[PDB]
Each structure stands twice: as structure tokens, then as C-alpha cells.
Design an enzyme around this catalytic site. Structure first.
Site, PDB file in Angstrom:
ATOM      1  N   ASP A   1      -2.247  -7.305   3.812  1.00 44.02           N
ATOM      2  CA  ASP A   1      -2.224  -6.051   3.090  1.00 44.02           C
ATOM      3  C   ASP A   1      -3.633  -5.505   2.867  1.00 44.02           C
ATOM      4  O   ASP A   1      -4.149  -5.537   1.748  1.00 44.02           O
ATOM      5  CB  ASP A   1      -1.475  -6.259   1.768  1.00 44.02           C
ATOM      6  CG  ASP A   1      -1.023  -4.972   1.140  1.00 44.02           C
ATOM      7  OD1 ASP A   1      -0.953  -4.927  -0.097  1.00 44.02           O
ATOM      8  OD2 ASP A   1      -0.715  -4.013   1.868  1.00 44.02           O
TER       9      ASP A   1
ATOM     10  N   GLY B   1       0.231   0.522  -9.119  1.00 43.94           N
ATOM     11  CA  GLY B   1      -0.650   1.652  -9.363  1.00 43.94           C
ATOM     12  C   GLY B   1      -2.100   1.254  -9.188  1.00 43.94           C
ATOM     13  O   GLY B   1      -2.967   2.116  -9.026  1.00 43.94           O
TER      14      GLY B   1
ATOM     15  N   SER C   1      -2.872  -1.326  -6.867  1.00 40.03           N
ATOM     16  CA  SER C   1      -2.936  -1.804  -5.474  1.00 40.03           C
ATOM     17  C   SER C   1      -4.124  -1.190  -4.739  1.00 40.03           C
ATOM     18  O   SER C   1      -4.446  -0.035  -4.954  1.00 40.03           O
ATOM     19  CB  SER C   1      -1.674  -1.398  -4.709  1.00 40.03           C
ATOM     20  OG  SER C   1      -0.490  -1.899  -5.307  1.00 40.03           O
ATOM     21  N   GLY C   2      -4.769  -1.930  -3.857  1.00 47.21           N
ATOM     22  CA  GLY C   2      -5.895  -1.346  -3.159  1.00 47.21           C
ATOM     23  C   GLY C   2      -7.199  -1.441  -3.919  1.00 47.21           C
ATOM     24  O   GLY C   2      -8.249  -1.560  -3.289  1.00 47.21           O
TER      25      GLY C   2
ATOM     26  N   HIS D   1      -0.254  -1.357   2.168  1.00 52.13           N
ATOM     27  CA  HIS D   1       1.019  -0.948   1.579  1.00 52.13           C
ATOM     28  C   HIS D   1       1.054   0.410   0.847  1.00 52.13           C
ATOM     29  O   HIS D   1       2.125   0.891   0.498  1.00 52.13           O
ATOM     30  CB  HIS D   1       1.643  -2.093   0.737  1.00 52.13           C
ATOM     31  CG  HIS D   1       1.206  -2.131  -0.700  1.00 52.13           C
ATOM     32  ND1 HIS D   1       0.615  -3.239  -1.269  1.00 52.13           N
ATOM     33  CD2 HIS D   1       1.301  -1.212  -1.694  1.00 52.13           C
ATOM     34  CE1 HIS D   1       0.354  -2.999  -2.540  1.00 52.13           C
ATOM     35  NE2 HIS D   1       0.762  -1.776  -2.824  1.00 52.13           N
TER      36      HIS D   1
HETATM   37  C1  LIG Z   1       3.303  -5.050  -1.283  1.00 52.04           C
HETATM   38  C2  LIG Z   1       4.854  -4.986  -1.197  1.00 52.04           C
HETATM   39  C3  LIG Z   1       5.414  -6.405  -1.042  1.00 52.04           C
HETATM   40  C4  LIG Z   1       6.812  -6.722  -1.628  1.00 52.04           C
HETATM   41  C5  LIG Z   1       6.808  -7.473  -2.900  1.00 52.04           C
HETATM   42  C6  LIG Z   1       6.660  -6.796  -4.136  1.00 52.04           C
HETATM   43  C7  LIG Z   1       6.652  -7.507  -5.348  1.00 52.04           C
HETATM   44  C8  LIG Z   1       6.793  -8.912  -5.343  1.00 52.04           C
HETATM   45  C9  LIG Z   1       6.942  -9.601  -4.122  1.00 52.04           C
HETATM   46  C10 LIG Z   1       6.950  -8.887  -2.907  1.00 52.04           C
HETATM   47  N1  LIG Z   1       5.489  -4.267  -2.290  1.00 52.04           N
HETATM   48  C11 LIG Z   1       4.923  -3.765  -3.421  1.00 52.04           C
HETATM   49  C12 LIG Z   1       4.109  -4.517  -4.227  1.00 52.04           C
HETATM   50  F1  LIG Z   1       3.842  -5.752  -3.933  1.00 52.04           F
HETATM   51  C13 LIG Z   1       3.508  -3.986  -5.365  1.00 52.04           C
HETATM   52  O1  LIG Z   1       2.707  -4.897  -5.932  1.00 52.04           O
HETATM   53  C14 LIG Z   1       1.958  -4.963  -7.030  1.00 52.04           C
HETATM   54  C15 LIG Z   1       0.946  -4.018  -7.244  1.00 52.04           C
HETATM   55  C16 LIG Z   1       0.104  -4.123  -8.321  1.00 52.04           C
HETATM   56  C17 LIG Z   1       0.244  -5.191  -9.215  1.00 52.04           C
HETATM   57  C18 LIG Z   1       1.238  -6.171  -9.055  1.00 52.04           C
HETATM   58  C19 LIG Z   1       1.330  -7.241  -9.973  1.00 52.04           C
HETATM   59  N2  LIG Z   1       0.286  -8.063 -10.195  1.00 52.04           N
HETATM   60  N3  LIG Z   1       2.438  -7.527 -10.688  1.00 52.04           N
HETATM   61  C20 LIG Z   1       2.098  -6.041  -7.936  1.00 52.04           C
HETATM   62  N4  LIG Z   1       3.752  -2.676  -5.719  1.00 52.04           N
HETATM   63  C21 LIG Z   1       4.572  -1.875  -4.944  1.00 52.04           C
HETATM   64  O2  LIG Z   1       4.906  -0.576  -5.200  1.00 52.04           O
HETATM   65  C22 LIG Z   1       4.436   0.252  -6.177  1.00 52.04           C
HETATM   66  C23 LIG Z   1       5.479   0.838  -6.932  1.00 52.04           C
HETATM   67  C24 LIG Z   1       5.190   1.664  -8.029  1.00 52.04           C
HETATM   68  C25 LIG Z   1       3.849   1.908  -8.398  1.00 52.04           C
HETATM   69  C26 LIG Z   1       2.797   1.353  -7.651  1.00 52.04           C
HETATM   70  C27 LIG Z   1       3.052   0.527  -6.527  1.00 52.04           C
HETATM   71  C28 LIG Z   1       1.950   0.095  -5.781  1.00 52.04           C
HETATM   72  O3  LIG Z   1       0.841  -0.093  -6.317  1.00 52.04           O
HETATM   73  O4  LIG Z   1       2.032  -0.131  -4.457  1.00 52.04           O
HETATM   74  C29 LIG Z   1       5.161  -2.433  -3.784  1.00 52.04           C
HETATM   75  F2  LIG Z   1       5.925  -1.676  -3.058  1.00 52.04           F
END
Ligand SMILES: C[C@@H](CCc1ccccc1)Nc1c(F)c(Oc2cccc(C(=N)N)c2)nc(Oc2ccccc2C(=O)O)c1F
Ligand SMILES: C[As](C)(=O)[O-]
Ligand SMILES: [Ca+2]
Ligand SMILES: [Ca+2]
Ligand SMILES: [Ca+2]
Ligand SMILES: [Ca+2]
Ligand SMILES: [Ca+2]
Ligand SMILES: [Ca+2]
Ligand SMILES: [Ca+2]
Ligand SMILES: [Ca+2]
Lengths: 142, 254, 195
Positions: free
Chosen positions: B90, B190, B192-193, B41
Site C-alpha cells: 500500500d 482519513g 491513510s497515506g 489505497h
Molecule cells: C487498505 C484497505 C484494506 C482492507 C482492510 C481494512 C481494515 C482492516 C483490514 C483490512 N482498506 C481500508 C483501510 F485499511 C483503511 O485503513 C485504515 C486507515 C487509517 C487508520 C486505520 C486504523 N489504524 N484503524 C485503518 N481505511 C479504508 O477506508 C477509509 C474509509 C473511510 C475514511 C478513510 C479511509 C481511508 O483512510 O482509506 C480502507 F478502505
């Protein structure tokens, strides 16, 4: 128990119940009071569960009220000391004792392996780094 | 990271920082000298494909202490089954153009084999989570690497203890939950990954990729991670394959 | 397919703790796991066809800790599972039935002794007694009759009661842990009378 001219003599717990085996009346004939006979009887009738000799592999048995308790030697466990801990050496058990990778085996004993950059020691379960920077290690702490 | 601590310089040596067009993108996990594991993602709206840098030995985003090493990424491989904007599968694999040099501040996390992870590492309660992500929901990002210890959960439990949000994406067999439900600690946007590493008998393994969650550290919601164990052989098969031209590669899963 | 186990019950006496559950296996086997609120899960009773698991050796490593267990169901040809209620050994384990060790007559006073029944808690291969485990938390209660029903209490294993030098009294004791509100009293021991 009751003999020809014994019940002419007042009851006796040793003689009648410990020495010989008594009946409920005989016990009641002694303790006289219902509840007193009950209290004694509940323990006098709910036998010695350890009689069937249920604790295996060396465990000791403590009788209870319609139950018992087994005290097992160190290498055994279970309700009746059936489980031999020595036989549980399988990977789904403490990773089979392996430091890293554990390969389960049917008739053969479990065999440990390692990750690239490590080598199995002589003990057959430990792994030592073959390279200066092995993977899962933090140099500053190691 | 929400509710974590600053990881001391050198104690999170497999943490990688993904940068695109110079800007901070995502975290990653060094798996050896040429490969790093990340989340699919992070690449959803990436246009500049040859402008992807991987930075290692990094700790403080506000300084260059000569411990950091960067390489450009030659290839990002994501499963063909992944659907952008969604949740499932992912994971991403990046082939560094040049191999970094393992040093005291640059060391890879071990990628275990499916059964060891499935039956052994899956049972150690706490695992570490780290990155330079937001310090709280929509809050600021961190300058120094942050770590967090989170307790893993079986999906049935994760489902049994979470507020039933009628729009929440299902937790599949390709992911697992971990963290807290009281809104105190969690990975965050931030991060993620980044890695979710489990410690076992003196060595650290890669068990999860920071993936998603309903907002950082929300009450009645755990953070969900990519179940790396399902991708071990896929990861392996790809690390044995010749460099297919082009940076992006949607490899078949499996 | 399989069926999740149910009615997971902890059965415990003198620390011999055994988890029981239903149903009887029909084309499936089970695996149990134990752990403290925040510790790693330890597997016991691998692919067992039995509906019980001896967790003693685990729970007695810290009887004052709180453990949760789970029972997995595997198809016999993440898996299904059910969590057990929580169990804190020290507060919930049943006190077995006590046993009068003796009752010596000292003048007008009579001394009744309760033997310390062994618990499954070990220490240097040895089994600690109920008194080494509970300590001051353990109160023994004596009942004695001459028609009458008197009682006495002691925080050791011995009682000294005033007997009417004229009759054969009877006894029966009970182990009691006052601090408890769950399984705080044991079944009364077997009646013992002076011949
Ligand atoms: C994957 C997809 C599915 C859609 C979806 C998104 C959210 C919930 C359900 C489905 N969508 C996303 C995530 F799931 C997401 O998740 C978390 C990431 C880190 C920590 C999280 C946590 N533990 N709260 C949650 N972060 C996302 O974007 C970012 C935006 C701004 C800055 C950084 C981001 C990033 O890192 O990509 C994103 F687009
Ligand atoms: C794991 As969930 C549903 O809380 O986000
Ligand atoms: Ca008779
Ligand atoms: Ca008689
Ligand atoms: Ca007789
Ligand atoms: Ca006789
Ligand atoms: Ca009669
Ligand atoms: Ca008679
Ligand atoms: Ca009995
Ligand atoms: Ca820096």
C-alpha cells in the site's frame, strides 16, 4: 594437616585450618557440631574461583561460592572482561557512531556519509546542512 | 488521529493534504520539492484523475493563512503487485506538476536508505503519526493537523499480542505494526497515506505510510504501516524515470 | 533456517548482570538487544556464537529501571527471536556472599564488621558499595555461637554483641533486603572464630 604428635593438642583454626590445610574431620574435631562444621566447610571447600585468574584485560576478580565476579576497567566488559568496547565500532552499534549514514567495513574502519543537503564535517561523523531547508528539520524549531 | 494532540503550526512541515475534486482525500509526505509519498489505497475508487490537488503548508482546514501552497498531481505511481481492496504494498508516489517552495512551513521529510532504516531507525521506539483524519472510529474528522507518538513493534510481537481475528489480513514483510493495544491511541481512517516519521540524531526520516488497521484504536489490535524501507530503491528508480504519459502508472515492483 | 533461542535467564550478582540462553549455536549466530519498557533498543553481543551476554554496563545506568531483552538468531551460511523475562536490577540482583572484615573484642562486648562488597554500579569511574546502592534497605544479620546459635541484626556494617568473657565465639553473616520477596537474603559468609 596432621603431624606425628600434633593431634595430641586440641584443634586450632589458624594453626590447623588457616596456617596449615585441614581436612573435614579435623574441622569437625574443632567445631565439634555437625552443622557448625558444615557451615564452615561449605565455605572452606568451595574454593577460590579467581585462582584460574579468569578476568582478562585488567579486570579484578572477587571469588564467590563456585563462582566469581569480575570488575572490569572502563573500555572492557563481559563475564571475564573479554569485550573491548573500542572494537565494537560497527554500524550495527549506535549506527556506528555516525550522525546519519554509516558504511560498515571489513578491515577498514566504519565510514560515515550523509543525506543530500548535508555535508560530513571534519570529525568524520557529523553532517551540516549545505542548503537553507535541509530535509529532516523543522525550521520553526531550528 | 485518535488520542493525539494538535500539531502546532509549522512542526509537521512535510504533511501534505490530498484533495480530489476539491474534497479531502488522504494525507501524504513531501519527500523533496516535486515528490510526495502516499498510500495506494486512496486511489481505489478515484475517477477524476486530473482533479487531484496536493496542499502543503496546511494546518487549519477552516482558514487560508497564506502559508499553504497547492500543486496539481501529474502522476500517481503504485506497484503493479498491489491489489485494490486489499492490504499488501500500500504505497503510491505522486509527481507534483510544479515544485512547491520550501519555506518555514514547507519542508520535506528525509527518505533514508534501506540499511540505515532497517538496522538503525527500525529501533527507535516511538515515531510520529499525523493527519486530518477521524478523531475516533467512525467519528468526525479534524480541522487542525493532529499528531501522535506511537511505539513500533516487531511483527512476531504484534502477532503475539493481538486478538486472533480469523479474518484479519496477514501482516507481511512489507509492513510493520505500531501503536497501542489498549484502545487508547492510533492512526485512523482519513489519515491513510500520512507520515510515520522517526527522529534520529537531529533529523527526521520517513519510516512508514499510514495504511490500515482493524478499526481505529481497537482493543487487541495495532495500526499497521507500510514498510517504506522495502521501497527505497523502487522509489529511487521511479524518481529517476521520465514522465510516462497518463496520471496513473502501475510500475513493476521492483 | 534457524531455531529461536529459549530459556533466556538473567544471572545477576552485585549487579554483574549476564543474560544466558539456549541452544548452543549450530549454523547460526545471535544478537541481543536491551531496552527499558519504553526506550529505544540497544544492540549488544553482535553475531555472538556464545550463549550469554554481559548487559552490566547497560543495566547499571539506572538499577531501578525495568529492562526487557531479546535474542535474535541469524542463519550462519524480521529474523527469529525470543524475549527474555523482565528484569529490574535493584530488586532481583543477587547479594553476593558477605565477608567478615574483622571482630574486635571491646571489654565484654565484641565488634564484628562486615565489609561492604563492591557492586558493579559505577560513579565517576568508581564502584559503589552495596551500602551506597541499597542504603537503609540493606540489613546485615549476624549468627554467633559460643553449643548455641544466637543472631543479631544491624542496618550498617558493624555488630556489637555481648560475649561471655570465657569462650571463643564463632561468626557468619548474611545480607538481607527486607523489602524484597525475591532474592531477599544472601548465602551465609565463611565462618570466623576467635583463636
Ligand atoms: C487498505 C484497505 C484494506 C482492507 C482492510 C481494512 C481494515 C482492516 C483490514 C483490512 N482498506 C481500508 C483501510 F485499511 C483503511 O485503513 C485504515 C486507515 C487509517 C487508520 C486505520 C486504523 N489504524 N484503524 C485503518 N481505511 C479504508 O477506508 C477509509 C474509509 C473511510 C475514511 C478513510 C479511509 C481511508 O483512510 O482509506 C480502507 F478502505
Ligand atoms: C495487528 As492486528 C492483527 O491487530 O490488526
Ligand atoms: Ca591437625
Ligand atoms: Ca586436629
Ligand atoms: Ca596441624
Ligand atoms: Ca602449621
Ligand atoms: Ca576425629
Ligand atoms: Ca584428627
Ligand atoms: Ca569460591
Ligand atoms: Ca488553511
Amino acid at each position: 594437616a596432621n603431624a606425628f604428635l600434633e593431634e595430641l593438642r586440641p584443634g586450632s583454626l589458624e594453626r590447623e585450618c588457616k596456617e596449615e590445610q585441614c581436612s573435614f574431620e579435623e574441622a569437625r574435631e574443632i567445631f565439634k557440631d555437625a552443622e557448625r562444621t558444615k557451615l564452615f566447610w561449605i565455605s572452606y571447600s568451595d574454593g577460590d574461583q579467581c585462582a584460574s585468574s579468569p578476568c582478562q584485560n585488567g579486570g579484578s576478580c572477587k571469588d564467590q561460592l563456585q563462582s566469581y565476579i569480575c570488575f572490569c576497567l572502563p573500555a572492557f566488559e563481559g563475564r571475564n572482561c573479554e569485550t573491548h568496547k573500542d572494537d565494537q565500532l560497527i554500524c550495527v552499534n549506535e549506527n556506528g557512531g555516525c550522525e546519519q549514514y554509516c558504511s560498515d567495513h571489513t578491515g577498514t574502519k566504519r565510514s560515515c556519509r550523509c543525506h543530500e543537503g548535508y555535508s560530513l564535517l571534519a570529525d568524520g561523523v557529523s553532517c551540516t546542512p549545505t542548503v537553507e531547508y535541509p530535509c529532516g528539520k523543522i525550521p520553526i524549531l531550528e | 488521529i485518535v488520542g493525539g494532540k494538535v500539531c502546532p503550526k509549522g512542526e509537521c512541515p512535510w504533511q501534505v493534504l490530498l484533495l480530489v475534486n476539491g474534497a479531502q482525500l488522504c494525507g501524504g509526505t513531501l519527500i523533496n520539492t516535486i515528490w510526495v509519498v502516499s498510500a495506494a489505497h486512496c486511489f481505489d475508487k478515484i475517477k477524476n484523475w486530473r482533479n487531484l490537488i496536493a496542499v502543503l503548508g496546511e494546518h487549519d482546514l477552516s482558514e487560508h493563512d497564506g502559508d499553504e501552497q497547492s500543486r496539481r498531481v501529474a502522476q500517481v505511481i503504485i506497484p503493479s503487485t498491489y491489489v485494490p481492496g486489499t492490504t499488501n504494498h500500500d504505497i503510491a508516489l505522486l509527481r507534483l506538476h510544479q515544485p512547491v517552495v520550501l519555506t518555514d512551513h514547507v519542508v520535506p521529510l528525509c527518505l533514508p536508505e534501506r540499511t540505515f532504516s532497517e538496522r538503525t531507525l527500525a529501533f527507535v521506539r516511538f515515531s510520529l503519526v499525523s493527519g486530518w483524519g477521524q478523531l475516533l472510529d467512525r467519528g468526525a474528522t479534524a480541522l487542525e493537523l493532529m499528531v501522535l507518538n506511537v511505539p513500533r513493534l516487531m511483527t512476531q510481537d504484534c502477532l503475539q499480542q493481538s486478538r486472533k481475528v480469523g479474518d484479519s489480513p496477514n501482516i507481511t514483510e512489507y509492513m510493520f505494526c505500531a501503536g497501542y493495544s489498549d484502545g487508547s491511541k492510533d492512526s485512523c481512517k482519513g489519515d491513510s497515506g500520512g507520515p510515520h516519521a522517526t527522529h534520529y540524531r537531529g533529523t527526521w526520516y520517513l519510516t512508514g505510510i499510514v495504511s490500515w488497521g482493524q478499526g481505529c484504536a481497537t482493543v487487541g489490535h495495532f495500526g499497521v504501516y507500510t514498510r517504506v524501507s522495502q521501497y527505497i530503491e523502487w522509489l529511487q528508480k521511479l524518481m529517476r524515470s521520465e514522465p510516462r504519459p497518463g496520471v496513473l502508472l502501475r510500475a513493476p515492483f521492483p | 533456517n534457524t531455531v529461536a533461542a529459549y530459556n533466556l535467564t538473567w544471572k545477576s550478582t552485585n549487579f554483574k548482570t549476564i543474560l544466558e540462553w539456549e541452544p548452543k549455536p549450530v549454523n547460526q549466530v545471535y544478537t541481543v538487544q536491551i531496552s527499558t519498557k519504553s526506550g529505544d533498543w540497544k544492540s549488544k553481543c553482535f553475531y555472538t556464537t556464545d550463549t550469554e551476554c554481559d548487559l552490566t554496563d547497560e543495566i547499571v545506568k539506572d538499577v531501578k529501571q525495568t529492562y526487557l531483552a531479546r535474542v535474535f538468531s541469524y542463519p550462519a551460511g524480521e529474523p527469529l527471536y525470543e524475549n527474555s523475562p523482565e528484569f529490574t536490577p535493584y530488586l532481583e540482583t543477587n547479594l553476593g556472599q558477605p565477608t567478615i572484615q574483622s571482630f574486635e573484642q571491646v571489654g565484654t562486648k565484641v565488634n564484628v564488621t562486615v565489609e561492604d562488597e563492591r557492586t558493579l554500579v559505577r560513579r565517576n569511574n568508581t564502584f559503589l558499595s552495596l551500602r551506597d546502592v541499597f542504603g537503609k534497605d540493606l540489613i546485615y544479620t549476624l549468627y554467633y555461637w559460643k553449643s548455641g546459635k544466637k543472631t543479631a541484626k544491624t542496618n550498617t556494617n558493624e555488630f556489637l554483641i555481648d560475649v561471655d568473657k570465657g569462650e571463643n565465639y564463632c561468626f557468619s553473616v548474611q545480607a538481607v533486603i527486607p523489602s524484597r520477596t525475591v532474592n531477599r537474603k544472601s548465602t551465609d559468609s565463611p565462618v570466623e572464630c576467635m583463636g
